[PDB]
Amino acid sequence: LKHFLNTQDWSRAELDALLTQAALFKRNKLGSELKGKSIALVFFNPSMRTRTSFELGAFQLGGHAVVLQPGKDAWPIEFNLGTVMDGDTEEHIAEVARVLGRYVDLIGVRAFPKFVDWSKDREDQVLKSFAKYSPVPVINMETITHPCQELAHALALQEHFGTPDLRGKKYVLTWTYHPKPLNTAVANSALTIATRMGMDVTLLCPTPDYILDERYMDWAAQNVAESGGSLQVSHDIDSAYAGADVVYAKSWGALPFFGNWEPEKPIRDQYQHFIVDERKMALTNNGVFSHCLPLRRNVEATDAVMDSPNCIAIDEAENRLHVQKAIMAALV
Amino acid sequence: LKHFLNTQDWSRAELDALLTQAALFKRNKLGSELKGKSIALVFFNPSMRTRTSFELGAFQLGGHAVVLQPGKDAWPIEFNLGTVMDGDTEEHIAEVARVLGRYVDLIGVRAFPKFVDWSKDREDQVLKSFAKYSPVPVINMETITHPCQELAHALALQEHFGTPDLRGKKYVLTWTYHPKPLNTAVANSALTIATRMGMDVTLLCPTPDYILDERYMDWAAQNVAESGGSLQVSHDIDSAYAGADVVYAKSWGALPFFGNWEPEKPIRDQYQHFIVDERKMALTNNGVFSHCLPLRRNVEATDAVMDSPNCIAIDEAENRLHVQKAIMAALV
Amino acid sequence: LKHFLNTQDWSRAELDALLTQAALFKRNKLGSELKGKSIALVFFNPSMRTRTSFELGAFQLGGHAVVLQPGKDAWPIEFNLGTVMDGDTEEHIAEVARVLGRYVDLIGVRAFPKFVDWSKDREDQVLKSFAKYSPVPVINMETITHPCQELAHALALQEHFGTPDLRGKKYVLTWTYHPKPLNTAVANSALTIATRMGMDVTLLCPTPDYILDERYMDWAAQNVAESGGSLQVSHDIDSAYAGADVVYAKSWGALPFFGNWEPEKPIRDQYQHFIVDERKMALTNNGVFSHCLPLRRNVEATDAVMDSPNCIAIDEAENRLHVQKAIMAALV
Ligand SMILES: CC(=O)N[C@@H](CCCNC(=O)CP(=O)(O)O)C(=O)O
Ligand SMILES: CC(=O)N[C@@H](CCCNC(=O)CP(=O)(O)O)C(=O)O
Ligand SMILES: CC(=O)N[C@@H](CCCNC(=O)CP(=O)(O)O)C(=O)O
């Protein structure tokens, strides 16, 4: 059974096919690829674009999406094995995935880390459990990676430059400020797809404590050696931005501080100058700027940058709809 | 771009066309006016009829409604401009409206005042922001006015009297009791449409403190001079009800007490006799009674009045579906 | 007007017709029985299978389900008559049911007891009120009985044994452990349908305090005399399980302790050995095991039992979709 858990699991040819089908769907939005079919959208965390785009995507292809929120409307779910369920969880994922598999044709799942212990969060237990027990394809709607975002982002870049080949472009993945410590998922995914696409990637972050999990740094290294791109880490803003063709910003909590955030608060607070403003963008090669959203204006990026004609964030957001339709079509 | 924010923004001819299309849709509920199209229903407050009628209306016309609740499932939204978003809000309406505009064909928004400062609530910031940033038509699902309710109400009245021309009828908009201070929206809208329709309107309320915002009293004055109706404020129950053809009740907090409600509590509590009962309705010219709902029985109106054959509240509620379908059809 | 409140209200012929239509729908899932029609799914409590199966069932038959949660998105509802609504409830069921009746073609309602006073909960006020005031058919999505579960369960059994005739089979309805006191609905329904089907039923529970309400014991007695089955209560595990063809487990709070649960805690806690494990199932005649779900593994039933080929819980869960489609088709 084929699932869409990570782009890293897919061959470059398969990903190129997905991006092309996405472009095709963007030209002809209504279809029958999902006629009479359905997808269960399981959300363990908030969402506006993901829920809306998947729900509309299902509708536009003749199917139907059922939106579920365990702990809210649906019953809370247990993922650990062999435990005595006398706690807060009401049922086990074994039953949840098997039951949904009798109803729907696809299952999407969104589950952010708990931010208590990265050793536990990095195992991707929720997503892996759905893929293990589900008799139908499972789609990652964001856990510790965000593959749907990767493709929406990639398509937006190929559209901007007018070509599917992004090799040679200088890509800057920069950490940015935020009052709270967030998920590294989008950053992990950006690093992954940017290198898979063969760009010259620079991971710009405040300190070594903000470097991404080795798993993704390794994927990136492997992707560069295969795509012909490059990878490097930087703690110097001006050098990183210089000559950049693309700048993608995202805020995330330092992995070393999982379960111990109050000491990280003062640390991030002394780097709010990482905010993407006109000055930094002016150092780029008339580069484009994007963000996965939701975005806090004048915190992660300034009003000027967001409203500049070089910001393609709205186009990338729109593309979530198109690439997800390609993903669902491919899996059914 | 044409939006449906207030009936006051529309010409009488346009409103008559809407009411006629609504009557047509009531005769032939299924259609293809929204085939393959979608509407985002953004709710910042509770709703039963509005969510249900819009959702079903979209379905019946071949489209699909996506229901969103910022702060619940969707991310909280910032509306103020140029501020540093380090608070509770996660994203700005500029991005929210632009993104939704890439997904849906229409956006409906429900956002009640915050009841802290009427000077701020009366600006209609949420609705105006959606209309400003959205590339697609925006529909008022109730903010400080409730135009969809106005048309459902108007159609019910024209149906009751068997004619679209309501000129000459004595219309009584009466305040009624409620344990809590509520939105003036429905009252503002009733005053607006009743005068736009050319009826002889009487705004019956306990004291001058309960008179509606000048904005609506002015709209009413302008509407009367154009429709041939009349407007007057009253604090005397029996004189107002006498010979009335229509009685529309709604409870609302006195505008002067925004941000200072505890002193208003004792005030409203001494006027619970404003409740619509058989005695008051017996003073009317065999008039009809209606309410926008939800309604607290034996508080806002008695069981007898609600169950009387003169109560058209259920018909008005049904009409929300028909007039909203006419509105969506007109905007697409 | 015909509603689906309880199987006990339906003749055996009508129920057999429903089960047969359910089997037919399971073979041909897409249809037009609900084309352009809609159902309002009103949930006062959590749900995963019920919401998902009804929503998908409506979609597969060409209709649309509107999911409502009073107190969450919809307004809270008052059911008592003639009271002064100055409390938490915003509107009365009289208005709610009448309004929904102008929008949808069917109304489903889920409302568990409040667990404070069984004398009040056993009256089934919510369900009865919807049936009383609704101009359209009402469907029980679980209140104090769970008729939809009864049919899904019955169909799964007929499928397992390869025949609609279950007479002669030894059926064991056993109480099982759970940290909290739960609804007797599923148990009441199991007892009802198992006897209606003519099986030899044994109600196995810890003590006389866990025996079901007389109403259901009476229905069972009446069903046995008509179907040719049998009914008996047992407090001995091994004797009950011996030679059983079917074992259905469910946990529920002792009726005598409604409104007084802390003293019941120690009582249930001394019977957690009622859990369905391999040892008890090995005493049966290679019998099948099922549960309505959600199920707490290693509490209500062990991992071994849940994963055994004799467990048909997933099939019963799937059948909720098919029997509910038969129910909606029959009522429209
Ligand atoms: C603040 C916060 O927690 N952010 C998330 C955004 C995820 C990407 N964004 C999306 O998928 C868009 P939507 O479907 O509207 O959430 C994060 O940090 O990973
Ligand atoms: C108590 C309360 O806050 N009431 C609202 C009712 C609005 C009109 N009513 C509707 O639009 C019907 P529904 O869509 O079911 O809310 C108010 O006072 O403005
Ligand atoms: C723990 C709890 O409260 N359980 C419920 C389960 C009801 C039957 N189960 C269903 O209808 C399945 P779903 O639609 O997913 O809830 C009870 O005890 O009655």
PDB file of N, CA and C and ligand atoms in Angstrom, chain B residues 47-50 110 112 142 146 149 182-183 186 250 292-293 320, chain C residues 75 90, ligand 2:
ATOM      1  N   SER B  47     -24.257  29.792  16.081  1.00  0.00           N
ATOM      2  CA  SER B  47     -25.297  29.849  15.057  1.00  0.00           C
ATOM      3  C   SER B  47     -25.889  28.477  14.759  1.00  0.00           C
ATOM      4  N   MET B  48     -27.193  28.440  14.506  1.00  0.00           N
ATOM      5  CA  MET B  48     -27.856  27.193  14.148  1.00  0.00           C
ATOM      6  C   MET B  48     -28.494  27.386  12.781  1.00  0.00           C
ATOM      7  N   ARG B  49     -29.374  28.380  12.676  1.00  0.00           N
ATOM      8  CA  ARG B  49     -30.065  28.665  11.424  1.00  0.00           C
ATOM      9  C   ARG B  49     -29.129  29.171  10.333  1.00  0.00           C
ATOM     10  N   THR B  50     -28.284  30.140  10.665  1.00  0.00           N
ATOM     11  CA  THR B  50     -27.386  30.693   9.663  1.00  0.00           C
ATOM     12  C   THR B  50     -26.452  29.635   9.086  1.00  0.00           C
ATOM     13  N   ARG B 110     -19.645  36.044  10.197  1.00  0.00           N
ATOM     14  CA  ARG B 110     -20.467  36.330  11.366  1.00  0.00           C
ATOM     15  C   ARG B 110     -19.532  36.763  12.482  1.00  0.00           C
ATOM     16  N   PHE B 112     -20.058  39.132  16.056  1.00  0.00           N
ATOM     17  CA  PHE B 112     -20.795  40.023  16.954  1.00  0.00           C
ATOM     18  C   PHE B 112     -19.875  41.039  17.615  1.00  0.00           C
ATOM     19  N   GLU B 142     -24.181  38.394   9.893  1.00  0.00           N
ATOM     20  CA  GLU B 142     -24.490  39.143  11.109  1.00  0.00           C
ATOM     21  C   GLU B 142     -23.284  39.682  11.875  1.00  0.00           C
ATOM     22  N   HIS B 146     -27.884  42.739  10.302  1.00  0.00           N
ATOM     23  CA  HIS B 146     -28.196  41.366   9.895  1.00  0.00           C
ATOM     24  C   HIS B 146     -29.073  41.450   8.641  1.00  0.00           C
ATOM     25  N   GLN B 149     -31.277  38.560   7.554  1.00  0.00           N
ATOM     26  CA  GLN B 149     -32.488  38.457   8.362  1.00  0.00           C
ATOM     27  C   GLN B 149     -33.529  39.443   7.833  1.00  0.00           C
ATOM     28  N   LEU B 182     -27.734  42.062  24.823  1.00  0.00           N
ATOM     29  CA  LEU B 182     -27.391  41.516  23.516  1.00  0.00           C
ATOM     30  C   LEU B 182     -27.118  42.524  22.406  1.00  0.00           C
ATOM     31  N   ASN B 183     -26.719  41.977  21.262  1.00  0.00           N
ATOM     32  CA  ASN B 183     -26.400  42.717  20.045  1.00  0.00           C
ATOM     33  C   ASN B 183     -27.612  43.518  19.546  1.00  0.00           C
ATOM     34  N   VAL B 186     -29.951  42.862  14.947  1.00  0.00           N
ATOM     35  CA  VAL B 186     -31.272  42.547  14.423  1.00  0.00           C
ATOM     36  C   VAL B 186     -32.214  43.749  14.498  1.00  0.00           C
ATOM     37  N   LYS B 250     -37.126  41.989  19.842  1.00  0.00           N
ATOM     38  CA  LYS B 250     -35.719  41.640  19.966  1.00  0.00           C
ATOM     39  C   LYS B 250     -35.183  42.326  21.210  1.00  0.00           C
ATOM     40  N   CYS B 292     -36.387  36.864  15.328  1.00  0.00           N
ATOM     41  CA  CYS B 292     -35.309  36.254  14.548  1.00  0.00           C
ATOM     42  C   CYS B 292     -34.840  34.898  15.078  1.00  0.00           C
ATOM     43  N   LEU B 293     -35.048  34.658  16.369  1.00  0.00           N
ATOM     44  CA  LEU B 293     -34.610  33.425  17.030  1.00  0.00           C
ATOM     45  C   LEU B 293     -33.077  33.473  17.125  1.00  0.00           C
ATOM     46  N   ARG B 320     -34.754  32.314   5.594  1.00  0.00           N
ATOM     47  CA  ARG B 320     -33.327  32.623   5.631  1.00  0.00           C
ATOM     48  C   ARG B 320     -32.653  31.802   4.519  1.00  0.00           C
TER      49      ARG B 320
ATOM     50  N   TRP C  75     -26.876  26.911  19.215  1.00  0.00           N
ATOM     51  CA  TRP C  75     -27.283  27.424  20.523  1.00  0.00           C
ATOM     52  C   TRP C  75     -27.805  26.316  21.439  1.00  0.00           C
ATOM     53  N   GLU C  90     -30.755  28.814  25.387  1.00  0.00           N
ATOM     54  CA  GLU C  90     -31.104  29.987  24.581  1.00  0.00           C
ATOM     55  C   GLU C  90     -32.426  29.871  23.819  1.00  0.00           C
TER      56      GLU C  90
HETATM   57  C1  LIG D   2     -28.821  35.227  21.802  1.00  0.00           C
HETATM   58  C2  LIG D   2     -28.032  35.951  20.725  1.00  0.00           C
HETATM   59  O1  LIG D   2     -26.872  36.335  20.859  1.00  0.00           O
HETATM   60  N1  LIG D   2     -28.714  36.142  19.602  1.00  0.00           N
HETATM   61  C3  LIG D   2     -28.284  36.785  18.357  1.00  0.00           C
HETATM   62  C4  LIG D   2     -29.282  36.319  17.291  1.00  0.00           C
HETATM   63  C5  LIG D   2     -28.952  36.751  15.884  1.00  0.00           C
HETATM   64  C6  LIG D   2     -30.085  36.440  14.926  1.00  0.00           C
HETATM   65  N2  LIG D   2     -30.366  35.011  14.813  1.00  0.00           N
HETATM   66  C7  LIG D   2     -29.910  34.222  13.843  1.00  0.00           C
HETATM   67  O2  LIG D   2     -29.190  34.623  12.921  1.00  0.00           O
HETATM   68  C8  LIG D   2     -30.332  32.776  13.922  1.00  0.00           C
HETATM   69  P1  LIG D   2     -28.896  31.753  14.307  1.00  0.00           P
HETATM   70  O3  LIG D   2     -28.065  31.619  12.954  1.00  0.00           O
HETATM   71  O4  LIG D   2     -29.429  30.316  14.810  1.00  0.00           O
HETATM   72  O5  LIG D   2     -28.063  32.458  15.442  1.00  0.00           O
HETATM   73  C9  LIG D   2     -28.332  38.309  18.531  1.00  0.00           C
HETATM   74  O6  LIG D   2     -28.721  38.780  19.626  1.00  0.00           O
HETATM   75  O7  LIG D   2     -27.985  39.017  17.560  1.00  0.00           O
END
